[PDB]
Symmetry: C2
Subunit: 611 residues, 2 copies
Amino acid sequence: HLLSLTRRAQKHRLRELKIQVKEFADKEEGGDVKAVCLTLFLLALRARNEHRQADELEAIMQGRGSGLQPAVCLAIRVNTFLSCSQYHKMYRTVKAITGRQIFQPLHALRNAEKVLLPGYHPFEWQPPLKNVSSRTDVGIIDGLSGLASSVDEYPVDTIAKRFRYDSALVSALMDMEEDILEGMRSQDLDDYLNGPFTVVVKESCDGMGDVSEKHGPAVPEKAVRFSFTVMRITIEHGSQNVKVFEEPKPNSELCCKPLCLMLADESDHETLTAILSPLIAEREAMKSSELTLEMGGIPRTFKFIFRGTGYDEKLVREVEGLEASGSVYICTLCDTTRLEASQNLVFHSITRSHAENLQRYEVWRSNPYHESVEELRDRVKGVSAKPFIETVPSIDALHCDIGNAAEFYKIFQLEIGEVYKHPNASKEERKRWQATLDKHLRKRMNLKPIMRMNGNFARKLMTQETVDAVCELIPSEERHEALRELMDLYLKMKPVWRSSCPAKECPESLCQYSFNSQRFAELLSTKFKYRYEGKITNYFHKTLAHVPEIIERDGSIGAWASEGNQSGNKLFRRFRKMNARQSKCYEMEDVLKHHWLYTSKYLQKFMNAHN
Amino acid sequence: LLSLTRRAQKHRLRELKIQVKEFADKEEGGDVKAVCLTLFLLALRARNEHRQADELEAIMQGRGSGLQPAVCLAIRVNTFLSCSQYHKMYRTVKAITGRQIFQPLHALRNAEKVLLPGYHPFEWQPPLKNVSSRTDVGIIDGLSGLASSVDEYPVDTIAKRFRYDSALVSALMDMEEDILEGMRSQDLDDYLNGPFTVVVKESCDGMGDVSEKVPEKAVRFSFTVMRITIEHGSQNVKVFEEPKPNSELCCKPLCLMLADESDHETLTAILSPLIAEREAMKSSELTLEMGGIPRTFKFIFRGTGYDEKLVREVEGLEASGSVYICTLCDTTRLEASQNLVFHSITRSHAENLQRYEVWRSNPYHESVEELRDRVKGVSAKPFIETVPSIDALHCDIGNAAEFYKIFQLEIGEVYKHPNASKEERKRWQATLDKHLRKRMNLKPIMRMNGNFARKLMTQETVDAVCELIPSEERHEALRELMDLYLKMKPVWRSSCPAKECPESLCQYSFNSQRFAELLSTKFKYRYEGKITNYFHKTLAHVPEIIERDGSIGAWNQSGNKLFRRFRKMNARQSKCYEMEDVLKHHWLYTSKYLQKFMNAHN
DNA sequence: TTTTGTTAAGGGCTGTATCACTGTGTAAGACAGGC
DNA sequence: GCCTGTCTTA
DNA sequence: CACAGTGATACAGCCCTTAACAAAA
Ligand SMILES: [Mn+2]
Ligand SMILES: [Mn+2]
Ligand SMILES: [Zn+2]
Ligand SMILES: [Zn+2]
């Protein structure tokens, strides 16, 4: 074979073709034997389907250098959870074996971290924020905010770290600079324009359940994560507000920028308020000022709108002074009781507010009309503690479906048992009704039975097909008509709470939602009297009573869902194991800085480069 | 021509393409690739562009700006990257640099096949007894066909293993480069094939709790290639020997199981097939092709990697609290305490099998105590032949414990107070602790460890403790005792005492006898019929073990961490495959081939 | 006169979209003490 | 016409 | 439960490969 033999030999075996090629080059290509042989070999390589070696030859002939910028190295390190030691091994190995420095060393990545972390860029607030420092070089700060720790004081059992809220807002904005400029471009606006931008910031807070690592005698360790999500940025260009940025995946863990991480129980009110109050204070202060910050060389100004929607009901109730979820006062939007909400199905309005709730706590505290505890509690509608966070409670598209399906399932079981006709039934009769329904759904609808309510059972059960199925088990067909119309009203309502923008996607559904929920409740009250027990769920109450008001308040439902942060805990634990110094004070800030970096849109752009 | 696009260059070169294809098919059988590569390389050399030419030769050899899939495997395995995480890095680097620096996942899998057992062919002459001759066998079920029906004994374990010979093959092929280069380094010929002898340390330990969160225990049966010698004429010249014998890096995993090392039924059931295979290889030659030449290997298996509890379990002996304290000899705790130094290695696997048979058959119709004295502790049938040794650590610890007791008792002067109470001795100990903290900065200890022994066993410490002893005649004795200890220590602590301390190795028996004599004269107070296996072995068996193994220190607590690592991050979360993936991953982690790449910066 | 596109049928690498599979977090109910 | 952790699994 | 996230696996999409016209330049 040619490649077995030596250069003198291969030259011997190829001399004839070499002479022919020199002739071809001089007669057609001006004597470039080098270029002609290169092209011949590249095209031969492409012919044998070996594109890899051909492209590598192309890159080495072009001399185009392969060097990853330290920011890309950081992107990979962060997004694959490599520790410093592991990254260093990979770096030194690739550099030693290819001779080229494809990955950058660790100090370069640290320096690139500095840009993407709070405390790097300068900024100004006009007018300066009330009770907030004007220093711009603040990074990670102790989450206790100088909380007293002497042995005399209350015992401090938690470790927490946080960013300064304005500083974190600056870091997040600078991170999305490229998307802001590209969004202005895509809206036919100018890169250099600086007119006032408005930032709609979604605020969130949740407990992360258990965080313990354990070798049994598991001592639990709970955590609280205080976060914010830039939802949209608009620019005033006229009497018009042009949407230059809108978060594509608003419930993702990718854009949920961690602001404060603490090892404490969300039910531990003393510590919750001690850690969170300084954040709330900076947030308040920013509500009354404009941020000037240099982007692409042009100073810009930003006005903020904080909307605390990332709070599940338990945390809403805790921070807004309300009673625990088992209370008679079931809604965090109005003053209805469970009985009231069960009898009055559709006509309620969003009457609670942070101010009213502050007021009601003061009424509770001072007892100004010298009332008994039952009368006082009635007066203040269950606001028996002082609220300390203004929230905007909502509902997720999931729970609307869930509540409706629970009700329809119970209706199916009772309509199989003809309770419209027989008031009483033993436990055995109802159990056989449910067995009949579950068997028939498994047979005709391929629906597994479930012992516990859940989302996709609801999704698959709330179909007209299932109504035909269950009607195959009902004697009277007037009740067939009733069930078909009830499910028709359900299907006329569902698009409003599921769509991403109901104002645009299903304007007739949104316009007729209130009329349809009225007819829904009227059908339940006339042709379904039996299913009234004075009981109802917050999910059903909110679905029938507050969906149109919540849409008009927020524009949508499905996007302010409670769905994503179930990944957070996992994320947290990972960072604590593989990327954190093993010391209580440092591990927290290492988790914080790694979580910050994991959320930066810059590095995520590098990690989606192929598209 | 170069400023032109693809269709353009294809057209304007179509004529030369037809002529070149004709010449290539007519002269080289249609091998157009070889002809254009050699043409371009020769043209590049012709223009004195040796850099560009050597770089293309390296791209065709895969050494520059393109990582060989084996090097990607080395990096991925050795940094614990999952396939998903590796793929993310691969695709991102490729997309941003345009070049395919890392190789795709399929290429790493194909390179894995080579480094795993079951790839190369080999032969055993004569064929191994009861072992299949198929050579394409890799990971196999560690239960080895153990019955699992509900009627049978309940199987609570999952295990995966290699066939022992197949693993030996893969391990030698891994070190092929080291063997050939060692042959060169001994001024021998690469092509020699005369019988290579491979010494193989065999090892076993349980790995504690493995669970990710009930305890889940694991056993690891593993081996280490310790030395490979070749025969030229009638000298046995060593061609390779491992530099770090006790490293996790060269401890090749053979079988991994989720079972308790004290679960004797399951342990025997799983490990007996590997012992059968090893028994079979003990009388056969391995023919194996390296660098084109068929070579021949014969193996020596030495099960020295067994801590005492596992030794006693697999060799049929009683538990550690027994009166038969030594696994090298028949001494009782009382005997070893009185005699101390004149003992010899007596026990062997065959003697233990026959002592079990004597226990079982009771041929002389003796009572249980007479029978136990007859079989010297072998009440269970052995099933693994071990080479029980000692750890240099335990020699130091046993000696240091004895010296600590002697110090506290010389402070309390126990010879003058035979009826001393518990609290008086406790205050003696407190005195010694306080003064050692004052003079040597030694924090008192609830338990004994190596660092304590290391700092305490000094002559200056003896001076410090003499500062609390009234009689100077006893200063003489304590200082001579410590001097003998310091003479004996190098012998058991070196990695090759026949070069590093030959004077001490020679004088060892004299020194041990003088040490025991001084204990039996001046220090009679600390005789109470009790002694530790570690001290017995240090005073009685160190020279014999050196004669047997040449080294003490040369023959697993990271094992737990490494097993857990691989299970959590690199394995399918399914009982069916987790062990498979863990074993394969550990095996790859131990290959000298990938390790070379990871050390490329040297 | 010099560069590229293009048709049609069809052949390998490569990229990603799943497979199957279990641990695990979260939460939905069940249930029992308030001696 | 109860409240509220603990526990069990889905 | 739902889903995350493992290594293995199946499937689709990739740029071509024969001749010829020919459109842009
Ligand atoms: Mn919560
Ligand atoms: Mn052990
Ligand atoms: Zn309400
Ligand atoms: Zn002995």
